[PDB]
Amino acid sequence: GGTILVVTGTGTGVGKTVVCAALASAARQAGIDVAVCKPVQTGTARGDDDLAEVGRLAGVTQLAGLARYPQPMAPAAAAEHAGMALPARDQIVRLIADLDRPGRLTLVEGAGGLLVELAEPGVTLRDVAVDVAAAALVVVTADLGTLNHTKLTLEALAAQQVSCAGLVIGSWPDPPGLVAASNRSALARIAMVRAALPAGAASLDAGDFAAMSAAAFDRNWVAGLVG
Amino acid sequence: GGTILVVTGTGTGVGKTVVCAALASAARQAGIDVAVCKPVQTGTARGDDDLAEVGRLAGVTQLAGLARYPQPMAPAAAAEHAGMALPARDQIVRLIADLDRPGRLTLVEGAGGLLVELAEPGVTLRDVAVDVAAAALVVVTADLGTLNHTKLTLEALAAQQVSCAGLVIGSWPDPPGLVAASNRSALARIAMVRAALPAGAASLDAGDFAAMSAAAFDRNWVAGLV
Numbered sequence: 001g002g003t004i005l006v007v008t009g010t011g012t013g014v015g016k017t018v019v020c021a022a023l024a025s026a027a028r029q030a031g032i033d034v035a036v037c038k039p040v041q042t043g044t045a046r047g048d049d050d051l052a053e054v055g056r057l058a059g060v061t062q063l064a065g066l067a068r069y070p071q072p073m074a075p076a077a078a079a080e081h082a083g084m085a086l087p088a089r090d091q092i093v094r095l096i097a098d099l100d101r102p103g104r105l106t107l108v109e110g111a112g113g114l115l116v117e118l119a120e121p122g123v124t125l126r127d128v129a130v131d132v133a134a135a136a137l138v139v140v141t142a143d144l145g146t147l148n149h150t151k152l153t154l155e156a157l158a159a160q161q162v163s164c165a166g167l168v169i170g171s172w173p174d175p176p177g178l179v180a181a182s183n184r185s186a187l188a189r190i191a192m193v194r195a196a197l198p199a200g201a202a203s204l205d206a207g208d209f210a211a212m213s214a215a216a217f218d219r220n221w222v223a224g225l226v227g
Numbered sequence: 228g229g230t231i232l233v234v235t236g237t238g239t240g241v242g243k244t245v246v247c248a249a250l251a252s253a254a255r256q257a258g259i260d261v262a263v264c265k266p267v268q269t270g271t272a273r274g275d276d277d278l279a280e281v282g283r284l285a286g287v288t289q290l291a292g293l294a295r296y297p298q299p300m301a302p303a304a305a306a307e308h309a310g311m312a313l314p315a316r317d318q319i320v321r322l323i324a325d326l327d328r329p330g331r332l333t334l335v336e337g338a339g340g341l342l343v344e345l346a347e348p349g350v351t352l353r354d355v356a357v358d359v360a361a362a363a364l365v366v367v368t369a370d371l372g373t374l375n376h377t378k379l380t381l382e383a384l385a386a387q388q389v390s391c392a393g394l395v396i397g398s399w400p401d402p403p404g405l406v407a408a409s410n411r412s413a414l415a416r417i418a419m420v421r422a423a424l425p426a427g428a429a430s431l432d433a434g435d436f437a438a439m440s441a442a443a444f445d446r447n448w449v450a451g452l453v
């Protein structure tokens with residue numbers, strides 16, 4: 001098959017959706033075919049739709065969803081509130097496998113955190129990554145407390161032998177404060193920092209976003225993602 | 228000896244120092260001798276030297292610390308920026324052991340989160356918890372993302388066989404809201420929820436904070452700590 005990458009965050013609201021789009025844009029521009037998969041989407045009643053956002057910002061059209069829940073809560077609670085159930089583990093793995101093919105980069109966007117329950121019982125994005133032999137791209141902040149959260153996530157990945165594809169600082173302030181710069185240097189000693197996306201990237205139009213995305217990642221790294 | 232109990236958070240700003248104070252205040256009202264050790268703290272020239280806050284709210288007098296950095300950063304970064312190394316694993320552990328005595332609950336308050344580098348090289352509060360044979364009490368939010376962070380912390384505790392003495396919701400909002408109501412229930416399915424402390428408790432005077440604290444914890448669990 002191709003290259004499957006799960007995109008997860010140290011926490012909720014760290015810019016993970018925008019990272020998926022930036023990476024998708026950079027990969028499309030290197031001539032890589034990109035599919036983006038969101039197995040579990042919550043907060044639809046509030047208008048949350050990360051697949052749609054990825055399409056808006058990066059012009060990706062191969063966008064695969066599965067479970068959508070109205071309330072902006074953790075999937076287990078959002079499902080319970082709507083009188084629905086969570087998807088089965090193999091339903092998630094099947095959705096990803098249908099997209100996977102040679103020369104394609106498939107991004108699997110988690111639902112707010114590596115150990116959030118996506119399927120019963122206690123099945124997480126980490127178990128999914130094991131099933132489909134995916135590495136994990138970890139989206140992080142530059143603020144106080146990021147080093148603990150990142151190290152917590154990276155330890156959890158290694159515990160099931162899920163390779164870490166690297167870190168992305170989801171939102172990098174201009175200008176960088178004293179705390180941010182120090183945290184960035186510390187983040188780079190823990191794992192590779194593939195990119196630090198400028199804040200407000202979600203406001204750029206299709207041209208500026210594509211340009212932002214192209215400059216943000218190392219070309220050699222993106223091209224090296226799929227044969 | 229007595230009971231050594233580390234108090235760690237899932238992040239910064241979750242109410243951990245207020246929780247340390249509340250447990251101390253509850254344990255004091257149960258007739259238990261309490262010491263609070265915060266080996267390293269940061270962001271002092273910014274907001275509160277945390278040992279003093281525990282004294283103010285809880286009246287603890289055995290307050291032990293080794294290092295204070297003014298920058299609001301994790302210890303390693305604050306010490307890097309200061310040009311002044313962290314304490315050593317040995318002094319942190321010896322400091323704590325020398326506080327430990329029968330009939331005494333010694334609370335050890337981490338700086339930030341469990342895997343924050345506390346003493347060089349790369350010694351974390353998790354390491355310290357092993358060397359002093361202490362269980363870990365985990366302070367968590369009720370907000371979105373607490374289940375991820377709690378599960379991650381409990382996994383990091385178990386990976387070095389550090390027992391978990393339960394969870395405290397550091398700040399319980401009013402009114403709760405849908406997520407917080409849900410997370411409180413979900414948290415109880417991962418571990419024992421020892422207490423949920425009302426938001427704004429840091430502003431209480433000593434008598435009100437002591438009343439809150441006695442009501443917040445189960446008397447039987449507190450008394451059983453020692």
Ligand SMILES: Nc1ccn([C@H]2C[C@H](O)[C@@H](CO)O2)c(=O)n1
Nearest residue numbers: 013015170171197198200201202
């Ligand atoms: N580089 C970034 C990262 C995030 N965001 C926005 C998008 C979301 O609305 C919120 C994080 O979820 O912040 C942005 O504009 N630019």
Ligand SMILES: Nc1ccn([C@H]2C[C@H](O)[C@@H](CO)O2)c(=O)n1
Nearest residue numbers: 240242398424425426427428429
């Ligand atoms: N139950 C609580 C927990 C925390 N805080 C305060 C203490 C700190 O000032 C801030 C949390 O970092 O909020 C509070 O007032 N009541």
